[PDB]
């Protein structure tokens, strides 16, 4: 049950697009991790368009940054495939050019990641 913070511009994703994007990331997580039931979190962080700058250039509402927070121990190959799948699936689900998608994965010891209160 990892966490995906998904930073997008206000009004870029309708609720149905949010569902589609969230399911794309969650399906990818299910696919490439072995977990049995879906528990991963997708947490959309919306901000007004114009709050993203790339190489100093103010952007519009068509950028997406996915910050995935994962337990350590997964192979490089698995992480590559999962990142690639997130970009491809979010691209379809959001009808957005893939070059507008950035994905970073941070890793922590599983002992200091607690989901559902640890219960």
């Amino acid at each position: 049950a990892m966490v995906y913070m998904v930073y997008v511009s206000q009004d870029r994703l309708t609720p149905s697009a949010k569902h589609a994007v969230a399911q794309a990331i969650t399906d990818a997580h299910l696919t490439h991790t072995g977990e049995e039931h879906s528990l991963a979190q997708v947490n959309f962080q919306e901000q007004p368009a114009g709050n993203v700058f790339l190489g100093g250039v103010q952007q519009g509402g068509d950028t997406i940054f996915v910050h995935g927070l994962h337990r350590e121990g997964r192979s490089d190959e698995l992480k590559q495939r999962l990142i690639t799948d997130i970009i491809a699936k979010v691209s379809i689900a959001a009808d957005i050019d893939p070059k507008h998608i950035w994905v970073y994965f941070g890793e922590m010891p599983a002992s200091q990641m607690v989901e559902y209160g640890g219960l």
Binding site: R81, T84, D85, I87, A88, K89, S91, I92, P98
Partner: peptide
């Protein structure tokens, strides 16, 4: 690369 293959493949299914 994989991403190019997967993106086109998913676009064909969507269509």
């Amino acid at each position: 690369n994989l991403l190019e293959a997967k993106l086109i493949g998913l676009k064909l299914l969507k269509k």
